[PDB]
Amino acid sequence: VIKPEMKIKLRMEGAVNGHKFVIEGEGIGKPYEGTQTLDLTVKEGAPLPFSYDILTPAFNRAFTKYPKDIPDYFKQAFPEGYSWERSMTYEDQGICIATSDITMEGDCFFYKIRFDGTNFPPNGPVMQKKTLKWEPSTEKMYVRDGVLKGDVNMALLLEGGGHYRCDFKTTYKAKKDVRLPDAHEVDQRIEILSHDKDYNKVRLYEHAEARYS
C-alpha cells in the first residue's frame, strides 16, 4: 500500500484569535526513511496576524522511520487511513486544538486539517510574531483505550533567545483494526526551509525516526 515515495496534498481550515484562514499544500516524501517536504500556500486570511510555527506540527506519523521490532500503527492503518485529535497548551494560556482525517488513493496522501487557536495575548510571541523555530523533539508513544496516544514537551525558540513552551497531547485513531505497538519514542525535527514576506508561501521539512529508550 505505502509506496517508498509518497506525494502529499492537503487543505487546512481554521481560526486563531478569531482570524479565519485556509492553507492548501502539496508535498513529497519517503515514509520508510522518515522525512518529507511540503510547499504550503495561504489561500484565505492572508496576511496572517499570528506566527506560522504554531501551525507547522499540524501540517502525518506515517512519515516516520520505523524499525522492525516496533509495529507501525500508522503505515498498517492504510489504504483506509487514520485520524488524529491534538491539543497544544501554551505557557501563556494560549491554546490550540487541531484535527486531521488522513486518506489515500494511489501514491498520494490526502489531509483535511481543522485548526482552532485562542486566548493568545496580543503582546505575546505568537501574535507579535517573535517565534524563530521549534526546538527538535521526542514524542512519547503509548497505547491507551485501544488507540495510540502521544505526548511531547514542545518549545519554540524566540527572537532574542529564550524559549516558548507548549504541551502537546495527541490521539491517533486507525480506521481499521491494526497491531497496536508497545510504548516507544519518536525523535522529530520540523523546520521551515523557506518562506516569503508574510508566509503566504512556505516550504516545510520534517524528519522523524521511531525507537526504544
Side-chain angles (χ1 to χ4, degrees), residues 28-201:
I28 194 144
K30 294 152 190 85
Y32 300 98
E33 288 156 34
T35 56
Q36 50 155 312
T37 301
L38 268 166
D39 295 332
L40 320 144
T41 288
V42 187
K43 286 281 164 185
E44 290 182 32
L48 292 175
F50 60 89
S51 157
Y52 203 99
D53 291 310
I54 69 147
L55 309 195
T56 61
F59 284 136
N60 183 192
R61 286 280 52 82
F63 281 103
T64 312
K65 179 162 186 194
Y66 267 87
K68 252 152 190 153
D69 47 13
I70 322 179
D72 202 326
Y73 183 78
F74 316 97
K75 281 191 201 72
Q76 255 151 208
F78 290 89
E80 13 252 281
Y82 75 111
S83 74
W84 54 254
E85 51 183 51
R86 175 175 286 156
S87 81
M88 302 157 272
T89 315
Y90 287 89
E91 69 173 299
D92 63 349
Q93 324 170 288
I95 58 172
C96 291
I97 81 173
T99 67
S100 184
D101 192 60
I102 299 165
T103 53
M104 211 204 89
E105 68 161 10
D107 63 5
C108 191
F109 276 119
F110 296 93
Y111 338 140
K112 195 198 284 91
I113 316 156
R114 180 67 205 175
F115 183 101
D116 291 282
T118 202
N119 217 40
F120 286 88
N123 311 125
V126 159
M127 294 299 313
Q128 278 301 273
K129 274 128 84 164
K130 289 282 187 266
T131 81
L132 301 166
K133 68 181 203 61
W134 288 102
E135 277 311 316
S137 73
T138 305
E139 183 168 3
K140 184 117 286 82
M141 296 287 207
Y142 57 102
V143 158
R144 209 191 268 194
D145 308 298
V147 302
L148 196 64
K149 293 248 267 86
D151 304 332
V152 49
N153 298 326
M154 293 280 275
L156 278 149
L157 169 96
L158 313 175
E159 168 181 321
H163 290 74
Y164 180 54
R165 277 282 318 281
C166 190
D167 280 331
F168 271 46
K169 275 160 203 301
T170 318
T171 306
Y172 305 100
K173 305 185 194 169
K175 278 161 192 155
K176 67 187 267 99
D177 282 283
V178 311
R179 176 61 40 85
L180 307 174
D182 302 296
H184 63 270
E185 305 197 336
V186 177
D187 297 326
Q188 291 124 161
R189 196 182 200 112
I190 192 172
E191 55 218 339
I192 290 168
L193 295 178
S194 61
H195 64 91
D196 83 303
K197 199 182 157 285
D198 292 281
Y199 294 67
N200 296 318
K201 301 207 157 279

